[PDB]
Structures are given as C-alpha cells and as structure tokens.
Ligand binder design. Sequence first.
Ligand SMILES: [K+]
Ligand SMILES: [K+]
Ligand SMILES: [K+]
Ligand SMILES: [K+]
Ligand SMILES: [K+]
Ligand SMILES: [K+]
Ligand SMILES: [K+]
Ligand SMILES: [K+]
Ligand SMILES: [K+]
Ligand SMILES: [K+]
Ligand SMILES: [K+]
Ligand SMILES: [K+]
Ligand SMILES: [K+]
Ligand SMILES: [K+]
Ligand SMILES: [K+]
Ligand SMILES: [K+]
Ligand SMILES: [K+]
Ligand SMILES: [K+]
Ligand SMILES: [K+]
Ligand SMILES: [K+]
Ligand SMILES: [K+]
Ligand SMILES: [K+]
Ligand SMILES: [K+]
Ligand SMILES: [K+]
Ligand SMILES: [K+]
Ligand SMILES: [K+]
Ligand SMILES: [K+]
Ligand SMILES: [K+]
Ligand SMILES: [K+]
Ligand SMILES: [K+]
Ligand SMILES: [K+]
Ligand SMILES: [K+]
Ligand SMILES: [K+]
Ligand SMILES: [K+]
Ligand SMILES: [Mg+2]
Ligand SMILES: [Mg+2]
Ligand SMILES: [Mg+2]
Ligand SMILES: [Mg+2]
Ligand SMILES: [Mg+2]
Ligand SMILES: [Mg+2]
Ligand SMILES: [Mg+2]
Ligand SMILES: [Mg+2]
Ligand SMILES: [Mg+2]
Ligand SMILES: [Mg+2]
Ligand SMILES: [Mg+2]
Ligand SMILES: [Mg+2]
Ligand SMILES: [Mg+2]
Ligand SMILES: [Mg+2]
Ligand SMILES: [Mg+2]
Ligand SMILES: [Mg+2]
Ligand SMILES: [Mg+2]
Ligand SMILES: [Mg+2]
Ligand SMILES: [Mg+2]
Ligand SMILES: [Mg+2]
Ligand SMILES: [Mg+2]
Ligand SMILES: [Mg+2]
Ligand SMILES: [Mg+2]
Ligand SMILES: [Mg+2]
Ligand SMILES: [Mg+2]
Ligand SMILES: [Mg+2]
Ligand SMILES: [Mg+2]
Ligand SMILES: [Mg+2]
Ligand SMILES: [Mg+2]
Ligand SMILES: [Mg+2]
Ligand SMILES: [Mg+2]
Ligand SMILES: [Mg+2]
Ligand SMILES: [Mg+2]
Ligand SMILES: [Mg+2]
Ligand SMILES: [Mg+2]
Ligand SMILES: [Mg+2]
Ligand SMILES: [Mg+2]
Ligand SMILES: [Mg+2]
Lengths: 387, 135, 61
Amino acid sequence: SHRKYEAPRHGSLAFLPRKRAARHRGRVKSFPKDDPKKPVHLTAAMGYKAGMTTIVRDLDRPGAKAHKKEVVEAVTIIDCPPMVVVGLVGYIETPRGLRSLTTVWAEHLSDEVKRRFYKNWYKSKKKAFTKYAKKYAENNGASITRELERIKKYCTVVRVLAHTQIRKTPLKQKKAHLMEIQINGGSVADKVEFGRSLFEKPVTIDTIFEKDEMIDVIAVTKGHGFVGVTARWGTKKLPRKTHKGLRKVACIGAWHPSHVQWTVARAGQMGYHHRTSVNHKIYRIGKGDDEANASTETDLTKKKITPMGGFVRYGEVNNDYVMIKGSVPGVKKRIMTLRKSLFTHTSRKALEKVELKWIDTSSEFGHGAFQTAAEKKQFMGTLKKDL
Amino acid sequence: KRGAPGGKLKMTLGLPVGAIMNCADNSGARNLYIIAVKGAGARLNRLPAGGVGDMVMATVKKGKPELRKKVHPAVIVRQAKPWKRFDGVFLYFEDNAGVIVNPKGEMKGSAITGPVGKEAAELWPRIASNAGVVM
Amino acid sequence: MRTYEDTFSGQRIYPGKGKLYVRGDSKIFRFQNGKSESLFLQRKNPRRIAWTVLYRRQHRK
RNA sequence: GUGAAGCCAGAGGAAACUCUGGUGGAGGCUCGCAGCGGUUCUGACGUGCAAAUCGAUCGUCAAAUCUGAGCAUGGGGGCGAA
RNA sequence: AUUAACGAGAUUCCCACUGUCCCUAUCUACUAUCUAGCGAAACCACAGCCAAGGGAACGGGCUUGGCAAAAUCAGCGGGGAA
RNA sequence: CACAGGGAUAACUGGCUUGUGGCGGCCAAGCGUUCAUAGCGACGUCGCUUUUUGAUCCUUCGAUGUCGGCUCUUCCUAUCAUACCGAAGCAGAAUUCGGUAAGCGUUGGAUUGUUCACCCACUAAUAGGGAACGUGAGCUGGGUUUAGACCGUCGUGAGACAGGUUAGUUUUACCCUACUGAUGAACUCGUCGCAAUGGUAAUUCAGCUUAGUACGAGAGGAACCGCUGAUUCAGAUAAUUGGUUUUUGCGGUUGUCCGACCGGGCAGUGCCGCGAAGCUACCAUCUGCUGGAUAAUGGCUGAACGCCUCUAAGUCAGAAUCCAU
Ligand SMILES: [K+]
Ligand SMILES: [K+]
Ligand SMILES: [K+]
Ligand SMILES: [K+]
Ligand SMILES: [K+]
Ligand SMILES: [K+]
Ligand SMILES: [K+]
Ligand SMILES: [K+]
Ligand SMILES: [K+]
Ligand SMILES: [K+]
Ligand SMILES: [K+]
Ligand SMILES: [K+]
Ligand SMILES: [K+]
Ligand SMILES: [K+]
Ligand SMILES: [K+]
Ligand SMILES: [K+]
Ligand SMILES: [K+]
Ligand SMILES: [K+]
Ligand SMILES: [K+]
Ligand SMILES: [K+]
Ligand SMILES: [K+]
Ligand SMILES: [K+]
Ligand SMILES: [K+]
Ligand SMILES: [K+]
Ligand SMILES: [K+]
Ligand SMILES: [K+]
Ligand SMILES: [K+]
Ligand SMILES: [K+]
Ligand SMILES: [K+]
Ligand SMILES: [K+]
Ligand SMILES: [K+]
Ligand SMILES: [K+]
Ligand SMILES: [K+]
Ligand SMILES: [K+]
Ligand SMILES: [Mg+2]
Ligand SMILES: [Mg+2]
Ligand SMILES: [Mg+2]
Ligand SMILES: [Mg+2]
Ligand SMILES: [Mg+2]
Ligand SMILES: [Mg+2]
Ligand SMILES: [Mg+2]
Ligand SMILES: [Mg+2]
Ligand SMILES: [Mg+2]
Ligand SMILES: [Mg+2]
Ligand SMILES: [Mg+2]
Ligand SMILES: [Mg+2]
Ligand SMILES: [Mg+2]
Ligand SMILES: [Mg+2]
Ligand SMILES: [Mg+2]
Ligand SMILES: [Mg+2]
Ligand SMILES: [Mg+2]
Ligand SMILES: [Mg+2]
Ligand SMILES: [Mg+2]
Ligand SMILES: [Mg+2]
Ligand SMILES: [Mg+2]
Ligand SMILES: [Mg+2]
Ligand SMILES: [Mg+2]
Ligand SMILES: [Mg+2]
Ligand SMILES: [Mg+2]
Ligand SMILES: [Mg+2]
Ligand SMILES: [Mg+2]
Ligand SMILES: [Mg+2]
Ligand SMILES: [Mg+2]
Ligand SMILES: [Mg+2]
Ligand SMILES: [Mg+2]
Ligand SMILES: [Mg+2]
Ligand SMILES: [Mg+2]
Ligand SMILES: [Mg+2]
Ligand SMILES: [Mg+2]
Ligand SMILES: [Mg+2]
Ligand SMILES: [Mg+2]
Ligand SMILES: [Mg+2]
C-alpha cells in the first residue's frame, strides 16, 4: 500500500557514485567555446589555498534594503605564484571524437617538472628529456619545426603545457603540478605563434584574470572515512528504545522487486569527491612586491594580507594572490584550478563593481583583538620583556 | 489577504509552536501562547517557528477573563535567541515578548513597555508610533 | 566603519566580533569575547579583576 | 525521627474540676546500612559467566523478621495464608 | 451505601524539570578492526544474475529474450516462500 | 490439556468470477425566463476495474510469523495544486465543463490501540491507489489470541459469552546472491588526454510598480514586461556567532595520605570557572546553465467537391513534456 504521508527523497542521484576521486589534482572537463574574432588569450590557471578572512564594503543595489549601507562578507585567499610554459599540443576532429597527434616540448626543463615523471627521484639517473634536448642542435632543429608546421596544417584546437613553481610556497612538497590550458583566440596560425613565444617564460595571474569577474573553482573536497547513513545521506534517527542500533534505515525495500535497489541509502565512504563550483566573484588581485596590498582608500595602514601569527597550518602569502567571495571546495595546502566562465551574465548582481573599505588581519589562532603588532604595543604599554 | 510582512530578510527563528512569551502592552493580557505562524510551509515533522517581526496566532493563558478562550493575532517584538543582520553584529534581548493586533495591523493597546527590535518597528508602522527605545 | 570598547574590560572591538546585549531596562552592553560576557553575567565587579582597564587605571598601573 | 500510659512542680476556680512546663520511653509506627525479596528499564546477554545469571532503579528491616542440625508426613498418597 | 490512614495497584489535570521531540552535534573507556598464538557450532538434494510466458493458478534450473571476464576485504539486512 | 493424521477440510496472501461496491458511456420525455443537449438526464440500455464485500476450495497443517503506527524507496492516473490551452446562461472579480500533461509537491496538532472518522490552524494544495491487503533475524507490543483475577447475563453443576476490565519472556547471520564502498594477476615503467555507455535537479509563493488603471450605472476590480525578497530541495565550507573539553592548559575548592611550608598521590575524568585546536549547526556562511524536436491548440497556401475548407501533397508558432549541453 501507499506511504501514509509524502516527503522528498534524501540526497541527489546526480552525484551518484560516492567513491573516492581518481586523481588528486582537479580535472577540467570543458573549456569556454572559442571565438576567432577575439585576441589570443589563456583560459585557466592554478594555485594553492591559504585560508579565509573578513572584509567590509558598502552595497550598490537599487531597490534593496541594504542599498548604500555597509555589509560584512567572508572571502577566500588563493596563493598564486607565476607559472612556466613548457610546450603545446594539437587536436583534430574524428568521427570518434577528438584525439591528439603531436606534442612538442621546450629545450630546457626545470628539476621541478622532471620530478613529476618519477616515483623515486632521489636514486634515479635523471635522464628524463636528455635525448629529446639534442633535437634542437641537429640540422638547426628541423625536426622541431616540422612538428610545428603539422599543427598549423591539420589541428583545430591548441593547448599549452604549464607547471607551478612550488618552491615559492611554504609547502614541504618539491614536485610541481602540470596541466593543459586551451588557447582561445584569432587563428590556428596565431595560436601557434603565441604559444611558442611563451616557451620557458613565466606568466603572471594578472594577465589571465581581472577584477569584478565571475570564475569557477575545481578541486577535490575534504575527506571523511567510512560513514553511516545518518550523516552520509541525512535520514531521520530512530527512537530511543530501538534494539540493535538506531542510526540506520528501517526498511530497505519491498518484497517482490526482490533485490536491494540502487536508490536506497547505505553506509560507505564520504568526502574526497570531485566537484566544480561556479559563479565566484573576484574582489582583489594583489601583488607580492607591494608592501600595502591589504590597504584601502579609507584605511591607510601599511600592512599585507597575512594575519598576525600567520595562517593556521599554512605559512605566509609572499606572492601574488586572488581574493574570492564565499567558499570553495578543498582543505588548506591543496592545489586549486581556476577556470573562466561558461555562462553569460546580465544579472546586475554579477555586473557590480566592488570597492573595499576594510580587511581583517587579526589573529585567527584565537580571539584576536589587534590588526598590527605596533597597535598592540601602543595599547598595552611597556612589558617586563622590553627591559 | 493573508497577513505576513513583505520584504522581510532571513534571520534566526527562536520561537516554535508551543512557546509562551510575555505581553508588552496595556490590553490586560499577561502572557501569550503560540499555536501557529502566518507564513509556514509544509515539511514532514517540522514545527512552525517565528522570529522578531512576524505575525502569529495565539491565545492568552493569564489575564482578564474577557480575553481568554479565544484566538488572537499577535506580533513578536523581542526574543532571547541571538541573531545577526547584514552589518554582521549578533544581538539578543533578555526575554520573549509580543503584542496583540488585528488582521489589518492595528494594535489593540496603546502603550508598549520596554525596548523593541528594529525589525518590528520597520514592518508595522502602528507599532512604531507607540514604541520608545528601538533596538 | 568604527570601533567600540568593551563595557566590562575596555578591550577594542572590530566589526563582526563579540555580541551586543540589551537589558530589560533599555541599557546597552557590548562585549568582545566570551570571557567578559560570562563574568558580567556572573555579576563580578570589573574593579576586582586584575586584567581589566578599570582595575589598572584605579591602581595606577 | 515521632513521642502513649505512669510520675514531679507551678497556676486558675466556691466546688466538680481546668491550664502550663518538665520527666518517662509504648507502638504487628516511621527514614535508612547488612541480611531477606524481586517493581521497572519490557536494559545486558540470549550457540550466555549462567538449562534463570549481570547492572542500575526498587520492597521490607525489632516482628505474621532471617537461619543451621536432629525428627515426622510417601503417589489417587502427602503438603498447601489456595 | 460511605469512609480517615495505608499502596513498587488502574486512571485525568496542574507547578517545577528536562535531547521525549523541532534537529541534530561532540567527547571518554571497552569492542569491532590488523598481527602472534589457540581455535569451535548451527546448517548443507545439486546450486546460486534477471524480465515475461506457461505450469500444482508467485521459477535458481524449462521456453523466448536481456546479457555475460581471474582471485578478493569491510559492512548490510531485499530474497533464498532462510 | 494429550496422541495418530489430514492441505480429502475452515481461519490470512496468491488464482478464476464480478452478483454487491466503485468508475465510464448511448438514446432523448423533461428542467433550464423563451430554448432537448451552456450546465443537467426520467423510462430504458452497453461497458470497464480488482484499493469493498460475497461465491468456490487449486497451492501450503514433518508451520510462508497473524492489527496498527514509525522509517525508507519506487511505480499507476481515474489530476488537488503548478505550465500552456478550448467552452459558458464567460462585462470585470470569483466560479463551472473540457484537452495535452505524472516533470515537481501534497503539512503542524486535541480525543481514540485503532484502519475509518470529527474538529482547531497554516498553506499554491492540504488528490486517490499498488508493490505477498510492501515493510517483526528493521523496531515497537497499545489491541487481538494461552496459563492468574473481578463484574453482568446464562447454566443444578464443571463451565460459556465475535460483553466490559486489570497484569502478562518478541530467539539466530560468520554461508550464497543482491546492494554500498575498497584492492587487484596477465601485456616494460610512467606523464598528459579522448569519451562509448550509465546517472542527472530544481521548486512554489510574496512585496513594489503597472493602478484605484482596463471593465462596469454603481458596488467593485485584473494582467504582460521590470525590481527586491522568502518556502521546500541539492552541493559545499568554518573568517565570524553558538555547541562540544583528556589541551587533564591555567585558576579555585572538599576529604584523606606524604611531619609543616613548597611540590604532589588517591576518590575508574573528585567537583566548579574560563578555555585555544579539531569537528560541527536553515543555531552559522556561499552557490544552483541553455540548445533542439514535439503534444493540445491557434494559423498559411490549397484541392478533392468549378464554391468552401489548418490537410489530403507542402508548411508557421507552440507546454512545468521528451532528447541533448
Ligand atoms: K504503507
Ligand atoms: K580573523
Ligand atoms: K503548513
Ligand atoms: K522508640
Ligand atoms: K536494603
Ligand atoms: K500416581
Ligand atoms: K502495590
Ligand atoms: K564483525
Ligand atoms: K591471530
Ligand atoms: K509466473
Ligand atoms: K526442454
Ligand atoms: K501436509
Ligand atoms: K495436494
Ligand atoms: K461489477
Ligand atoms: K482485489
Ligand atoms: K474477490
Ligand atoms: K484456501
Ligand atoms: K498450514
Ligand atoms: K500515527
Ligand atoms: K505471506
Ligand atoms: K506489522
Ligand atoms: K488488555
Ligand atoms: K506486572
Ligand atoms: K549474509
Ligand atoms: K540519458
Ligand atoms: K545534464
Ligand atoms: K551539511
Ligand atoms: K576553525
Ligand atoms: K571550539
Ligand atoms: K572538564
Ligand atoms: K586527578
Ligand atoms: K545551514
Ligand atoms: K494543427
Ligand atoms: K516550431
Ligand atoms: Mg501518495
Ligand atoms: Mg527492547
Ligand atoms: Mg581559530
Ligand atoms: Mg511525526
Ligand atoms: Mg514496620
Ligand atoms: Mg519503612
Ligand atoms: Mg529485557
Ligand atoms: Mg549476541
Ligand atoms: Mg524471475
Ligand atoms: Mg501467471
Ligand atoms: Mg529455488
Ligand atoms: Mg537461455
Ligand atoms: Mg545483520
Ligand atoms: Mg533475507
Ligand atoms: Mg500433524
Ligand atoms: Mg485443496
Ligand atoms: Mg454495478
Ligand atoms: Mg421545456
Ligand atoms: Mg439512469
Ligand atoms: Mg513447508
Ligand atoms: Mg519468510
Ligand atoms: Mg520459517
Ligand atoms: Mg488522462
Ligand atoms: Mg484539469
Ligand atoms: Mg502526534
Ligand atoms: Mg488487494
Ligand atoms: Mg502487509
Ligand atoms: Mg521482513
Ligand atoms: Mg498487551
Ligand atoms: Mg487470560
Ligand atoms: Mg484456573
Ligand atoms: Mg445462578
Ligand atoms: Mg523477532
Ligand atoms: Mg548520456
Ligand atoms: Mg469610468
Ligand atoms: Mg567558542
Ligand atoms: Mg590533597
Ligand atoms: Mg485556404
């Protein structure tokens, strides 16, 4: 007979296989569609997650209740040292999908990248690209220019190979991360010319993104272990006097379908899934050589973005950084992937220009009360330590 | 039309059905006992609940015998559950209290004892006139 | 954007921190953390708590 | 813990008698430890430590209370506050 | 027919109280879990992926289709008309 | 209370039937101010369904756990609400009849063991059903239905009552499959990619303006675009607020022990105040896209049928539907 009262199902079937992700680094499954009438440009970058903080600004939204008043919002900080371009790839269209036919590298590669191709680097002979490099010194590199001409003639999608400089962060890891970044722009000949001219050169994040732009963040979520149904799916707890456990589901299916079905909630692994969160607005792109990259027009204090005592379980942000409104998936120290938007925005909430007024820099290791070390000393006075 | 304020912003709700709050006007009632909330949706096993500034159906349990055994509309004016606004400040009062109104929104009494929250004053102009210290 | 001062201990308050309390007689109190609020509600005297501003300025320290 | 008869002293009234303060230590009286018992969790365990046990919460506790040894009643018979 | 006192006897309301509930979160010890040593029992025609059909009128095996790739670990309570 | 048996024979599911229950049609006397058919349908008559109850006795008596609630998933359409439409005895507002449509929802409580029912209140709405009358090695045990006990009626009596009442033990998974997750032999070891197939997600309301306007003698009284919020659902996150305390971190304090002070042990964490880190809450914060082909319906050109006709050849628009991103 029918269920006595109505209620929606617990959870969504769209994120259905609740398994661990295949790869630790996030994966870009689609790129924005190309327009040949625009100048050549990149479409993605990568960085590392530092933490969160608080800001204050005044809203601009006619008709709203908080119009022309101050608001408090939470933000996220991403540490983004520049990337180095190493090579490019070409793709062609087939009745079975896209496939790659060539890839051409640069002459010199750093030890950061070469560690990626090894699992015991400390005792190897480190010969990863030794024979490939000699192709540049033979016949004026005719074999290198032959492959470039092939891409100009047959390929219709061009992507670049780039890696992070992980030695500029406080992380203990020495092995860099590598990915492919598509080039959207004018012509296939233009894409190859632009891509090759960037060989073994650094690229800064301010040349890719800008302020007041909506972007997407791709990463793997925080991991929990083996988890029961109550927390994994959100089912009602059973009464207090239930024998043999009360954190379960009471009925896992009717009689005659005669199998446990795929739509019932059961205990298993939770967390560490691949996710793609969209529509995050960029508030600030700060430079690493600026000594006042956390100061505004109405707040003239000379200070940087790092809180007093440093970010917890992370070091200090000594490089360029991007400030994003809200939250993103992933724990601290984890590699983030930033991608341009696939959507069109006309909402008057995504077209707003943001001007900041104050940025919190107090300690997050406790109930911090001062913004700078000088201010704390001025308030307290003189201590026995100062002699 | 059904009486529930238009344009109210999201806030923490501290008073579910079955709670008794104080009466804060001179109508003769002492306490109010909540039986419904004027905007609640539908969900299995979820009690309706309200906060500062929204209409409620209630009965009086102590007061003049002319007001007992009846159902009156009412508006909540202060609550003891902390909550925040868009300026990021968490605030809370010392007790829970409300006043008696009619479906159109006019107050039955004429005076209010104690402070009231800003949400109640902004949404119901009649309560604003009789209020003293606001927030 | 402005700062406030803790009513019980005098510590500085920046936006978003602490809480605001409105008592039954329409008096407003502000606190910076949970240590101040708990001692106030226990009805301690700030002039006998050695780390408060009131205690320090009274003893001339 | 409570405080029955009997006994001492003082006060009131014409008498018959009445009031107050002590002393005394009765009751199949009462709170509660050991023993004796077994209300609930319809708790633990339920191929158990255990063919009836374990834990917390409970009933009675100076008398129709608890208990050892010796002796008597034997199957259509015994014994039974049933 | 009434009835003071008494009751681990059945029932209705009130004050206080609380995670019984809105709505669920967190901590500690012993397990489970992995290892060394030691080491049983219940049960068992043969076995073990489905949809429909007909059939002793609800098939694991038959007929027509869907399909179908070694050896394995932690849980689970739909079926085996267990 | 006992034994030998019986599915040759009742009490539950399943199977054939459909009287009875439920639902849908045909004709046209009549109602409807005139006017059979806007909305209805007397006398008659044809069907459908298996969520009622009967009729039968095919399977099970060397046993298939017998009411109701709680929890959870999916399916049907005979559509309560939501999308887009046709009709009126449709001026506007409110209503009534009909089509495509099951994508998305369909509640908080007082009394009763209840299924069923009846009230109070919110809401866009508080539709009807199946899955062994779904679901006891998932719970519960209030009822019914063993043994103790009381009452009424009945019986000389032992005892009876689909009459009332009170107390009454809910066992086992370590095997196979199914399901949720996790490793892995064979073709050298790695880095970067493609995408067959499988899954799929959003939902409803309010305020301002249009506007006291259209319509209407008056009383009354809309809608499209535009702006800002909120309900139910989903995926994350911990700057801030709150909860948690073996940080046994600092402080206070009782009993006892180390002769006193200092510094400590024990009372399975002696007890109390504050308490970082980690976990965590619509008790906190962030985020949720647009292409194609169509159904109902309204049209274009246009014969059959020298006129007419959305259709027969050809063709336009088009829904919360369908297939993709
Ligand atoms: K059911
Ligand atoms: K901070
Ligand atoms: K409701
Ligand atoms: K005595
Ligand atoms: K005792
Ligand atoms: K005998
Ligand atoms: K008794
Ligand atoms: K086990
Ligand atoms: K072992
Ligand atoms: K069959
Ligand atoms: K055969
Ligand atoms: K038999
Ligand atoms: K037979
Ligand atoms: K019939
Ligand atoms: K039937
Ligand atoms: K039947
Ligand atoms: K039968
Ligand atoms: K039988
Ligand atoms: K119920
Ligand atoms: K059955
Ligand atoms: K049942
Ligand atoms: K009974
Ligand atoms: K009993
Ligand atoms: K099993
Ligand atoms: K599909
Ligand atoms: K999709
Ligand atoms: K959550
Ligand atoms: K934290
Ligand atoms: K904490
Ligand atoms: K503690
Ligand atoms: K201790
Ligand atoms: K939340
Ligand atoms: K048509
Ligand atoms: K079309
Ligand atoms: Mg239903
Ligand atoms: Mg039990
Ligand atoms: Mg912190
Ligand atoms: Mg319920
Ligand atoms: Mg006694
Ligand atoms: Mg006693
Ligand atoms: Mg038990
Ligand atoms: Mg067991
Ligand atoms: Mg089958
Ligand atoms: Mg059949
Ligand atoms: Mg079989
Ligand atoms: Mg076959
Ligand atoms: Mg089990
Ligand atoms: Mg089973
Ligand atoms: Mg037999
Ligand atoms: Mg038979
Ligand atoms: Mg009939
Ligand atoms: Mg007529
Ligand atoms: Mg008829
Ligand atoms: Mg059998
Ligand atoms: Mg069975
Ligand atoms: Mg059996
Ligand atoms: Mg239909
Ligand atoms: Mg309809
Ligand atoms: Mg209830
Ligand atoms: Mg049936
Ligand atoms: Mg059943
Ligand atoms: Mg079962
Ligand atoms: Mg019973
Ligand atoms: Mg009996
Ligand atoms: Mg008897
Ligand atoms: Mg008689
Ligand atoms: Mg059982
Ligand atoms: Mg697909
Ligand atoms: Mg006019
Ligand atoms: Mg805290
Ligand atoms: Mg001591
Ligand atoms: Mg024509």
